[PDB]
Design a protein around this ligand. Structure first.
Ligand SMILES: O=c1n(Cc2nc3ccccc3n2CCCCO)c2cnccc2n1C1CC1
Lengths: 435, 435, 435
């Protein structure tokens, strides 16, 4: 299962063992609620005005390397469908197909065959239960049943109200679990995809959008926009990097280097999907949920940067500085510690206290027997996930650089770019020498 | 209406056709709820203890270029009013003016004439409905009416609880739609401003704050802080930029350049308001809602950077790198595609599939007939907004630069700054030549 | 109390007078709800199916200098406990200890002695109130009491549903105020710590996590993860910095410099905790709530950068540019104004209007008599906190630099790094001179 290697030479760690679940596409579907246009009945008269107020609100609704990412439009697929429902006869084409069945496909005269779904029939209820008796007296409940149907409308309306028509995650009121699962059952997708979504509906919900579309002809329509997971069960690995600095006694005489390529990496279609912001990803035990909108597509060679950062096949990205501050990175199965200067850095067991005091430099410790890590005044709990760690001994590459000609304000840089800068300044040095 | 030009020479696009709605100021108003200090009645006894618990909770409450932005204090206007209500007699000055009318102006003895507003009178209700009968028996409902008044208190209290006294957006419980609209009617603002806010109350709500102020003398007061839109119906345009790189076969021999000045631009008072984070802005069809807190004020000359980026009147901002990664930017009426290296970049129609395969470089495609764009493993839906696009053919300016003396780690840079760097290094070259 | 000095020489301001409250550790505790496994009764039959649906949802849940910060794992302490509850007999060890008392310590056979707490006993209720009568008829309410117990379950379930098992802030449904306060009473902490948390429960709530742990053996368990405030009542001060530029008439001939070390500073354990993102901190009157996860530990010498930025004991961090844009920073007791170019910058009184027009450069004004500040098209309200300001006159240090050899794209830089860059280029100049 989960494993982790630490590289002393580059102050970085890789956690492998994970399986992908990447949102690669969207599945849109039109969700409809049909509406009515209007002593134990005083309850019903109350709920009935809660009703009109919701309808009223609804009508008011009308009238390091992350900077390298592109810029999408997350709900462009859903709004594309909404804009079509505004065509005339298009709300009736839906209203007609959803007469004798609660789920139908409406060819929207735009290209898409959209799955339409009537989740709530208030129009029918109010007109075939409340309307005949509103012409004084109430039976049994009924009162209960209406309060339940209606409350859902109020919840949906409250969400669209506070979010100005677009919500996420998709609540159980936008789409109940039984509705969602039947939607999943009728998706043109592999059985693996269906079981993945069913075992993780709340994650699925979190990657979905609900877009308020239209109120017209006693019908409320919103578009639910669900994730397509086109990439599933491919290898994933997370890269943790921390500043690697020299440790000369004299303050400010030090140089530093950080691999800037931290994030999630997943094998994808012959390339590797890279996610520079490792919080656009959510881990569940050993399954990594990601969104390809927040990714770059890179050559698979990129993994060579961990094995060997000076390699000729991929140019590994680094940043440089003279800023030797202490800090820690909490990995999947341990902790990276960049201890510099006068800082007090330790690792501790819950019951025994400090078991390791860190030297200046960059070091690593596994969660096996260690509960917390301390850098300066910052206490970090480590992840207590079960796995195996490997410490890969090696000379910190920062020691291979002469501080005199080291370039120290590079951010969008790399190993070859830095060497190029060094060569250039050694050229100048050997040319003034001959003077 | 909406239109868009793409500039091949600078890998950028401008969407024009939009109308401004900029929050330029705040409108504060004190909102008050008067409180009471204490078999079908067992319901009322229940709601009455829900009441005391809310009061209890309430009392506990007491005792690219974005880095160039300034730093405001969003609720400083509202807290300014709150701090005054803590003066003595100031809660009574309010409580006295709101005796026979539900809406009054209280001169707060600080300068401001604040609009005071009593939205809920629980004190009166409990003491003139529940208190006389609590001395055993219940009439009719009444039970219903109290549950409704009280539920609002509980909703307001829940919001102030989970947000530690400051909430946004302002919910329909903080301020109902009928209350908000009457507030809007009595605002010292132009009719255009009133219709704008009325046609978009949920957006208005989203730009408002609710600040819990005080509980004192059987009175709950919070300050609602509503947006003033001082700039309305002025031209707006959004700028989309993407990395422009050379495309030499040999990996890593390439240079790149990105216009760093993407964002919203709105004509404002003889200058142009620039919003570097184009998600501090929300578009509704063709109206752009923005906040001037998140803006810079620039010369109107800034638009010349699109027509002609080498112009003498404004120095256009760019960043440089050697990092030729592929990506896409989804514009208002199409997509910009920066395809580099081995990446597979295409555009597709829903029903027909791939209709264009992109060459290495920077290119553009309109939403007219194109539904999705693909860069590497990333599928992007384009916006299906109705508009007209224009492709402005031109030589990519990156081809005008000799890679040998190109400065490649500039972020906070510009066209003239880069030329200055180039001149300097050509000076050195022509001085070593004469050796 | 609160005071503020402005430094004209470096365009910066320091607000002192604050007292710390730093989350330094976590306090975890297992919270349990015991569950049942199954005409006025039609209400109860309703609430009973709301019940089963919640249980159903719950079971589905199973199966400038911020870039210098380290990377923690916020809920690693809580999940550590959760993973233990999944051991066998571990849910029964809890269920057994919580038989005759509602609060017990369960030695989890892992090391920790965790505080276990049964907040809601639905199993007992349903089986000792509803189950004997479900074998037709209902007494009194009871109906009310069940609706209240059950509603809490539904609220807890709704939160865990929409947040996929991890929530924050911890709601009054996860943990009521009376439960929280008893938890606080039994914490191994100083009386100062207890009074601090009791006077600020909503802030405490905002720094807490609730982590859904397990459903097993008619028991629901979640881990509430509360903040430990190990540092309390130590001096804090916030640093405000703004761009300091030259003001030569000719556009683009100017140089700029910004102290990049803005944020919160708190005295902590012989060092100083620095918080580069001053919105990971929340002020309540004069108490600063912070999280040490978002901090660096620095030498106490760092405060010398305000007194004297050219000092030999700490190297003060600055960034440089040629980008002279106007902006403002709203401080605790006034405003910093960086006015450059053609921008219109003013300060105004509510009742009197413009009382100061700013010259080009960097200037400051206190909240005493000033209500708003205007830079370009941006209106800023100042904070109306009561305090004393001091303007420290001084030559802006930017005027000490020759523009010809000034390094203008440094971000991760400092005063000594810049001088070093200058010396190097003056070396080259004096060596070409002798030619
Ligand atoms: O995003 C960046 N940049 C880009 C960058 N370069 C610059 C040069 C001069 C002036 C400003 C510059 N900025 C803007 C940084 C604004 C952060 O709030 C960085 C440069 N050096 C070190 C870390 C950097 N990061 C971190 C990932 C957050």
């Amino acid at each position: 299962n989960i494993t982790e290697e630490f590289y002393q030479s580059t102050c970085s760690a890789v956690s492998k063992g994970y399986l992908s679940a990447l949102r690669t596409g969207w599945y849109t579907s039109v969700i409809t609620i049909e509406l009515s246009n209007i002593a134990k009945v005083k309850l019903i008269k109350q709920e009935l005005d809660k009703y009109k107020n919701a309808v009223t609100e609804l009508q008011l609704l009308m009238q390091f390397l992350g900077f390298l990412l592109g810029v999408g439009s997350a709900i462009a697929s859903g709004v594309a469908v909404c804009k079509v429902l505004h065509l005339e006869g298009e709300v009736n084409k839906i209203k007609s197909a959803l007469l004798s069945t609660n789920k139908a496909v409406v060819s929207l005269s735009n290209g898409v065959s959209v799955l339409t779904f009537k989740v709530l029939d208030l129009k029918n209820y109010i007109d075939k239960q409340l309307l005949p008796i509103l012409n004084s007296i109430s039976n049994i409940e009924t009162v209960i049943e209406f309060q339940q149907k209606n409350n859902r409308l109020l919840e949906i309306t409250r969400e669209f109200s506070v979010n100005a028509g677009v919500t996420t995650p998709v609540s159980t009121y936008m789409l109940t679990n039984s509705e969602l699962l039947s939607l999943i059952n009728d998706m043109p997708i592999t059985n693996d995809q269906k079981k993945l979504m069913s075992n993780n509906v709340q994650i699925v919900r979190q990657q979905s959008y609900s877009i308020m579309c239209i109120i017209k002809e006693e019908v409320l329509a919103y578009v639910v926009q669900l994730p397509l997971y086109g990439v599933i069960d491919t290898p994933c690995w997370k890269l943790h990097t921390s500043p690697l600095c020299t440790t000369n006694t004299k303050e400010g005489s030090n140089i530093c280097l950080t691999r800037t390529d931290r994030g999630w990496y997943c094998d994808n279609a012959g390339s590797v999907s890279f996610f520079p912001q490792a919080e656009t990803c959510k881990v569940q035990s050993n399954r990594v949920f990601c969104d390809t909108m927040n990714s770059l597509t890179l050559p698979s060679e990129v993994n060579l940067c961990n094995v060997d950062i000076f390699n000729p096949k991929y140019d590994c990205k680094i940043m440089t500085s003279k800023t030797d501050v202490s800090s820690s990175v909490i990995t999947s199965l341990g902790a990276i510690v960049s201890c510099y200067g006068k800082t007090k850095c330790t690792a501790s067991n819950k019951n025994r206290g400090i078991i390791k005091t860190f030297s200046n430099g960059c070091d690593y410790v596994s969660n096996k027997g260690v509960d917390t890590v301390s850098v300066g005044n910052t206490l970090y709990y480590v992840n207590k996930q079960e796995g195996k760690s490997l410490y890969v001994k090696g000379e910190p590459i920062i020691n291979f650089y002469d501080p005199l000609v080291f370039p120290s304000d590079e951010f969008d840089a790399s190993i070859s770019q830095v060497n190029e800068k060094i060569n250039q300044s050694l050229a100048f040095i050997r040319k003034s020498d001959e003077l």
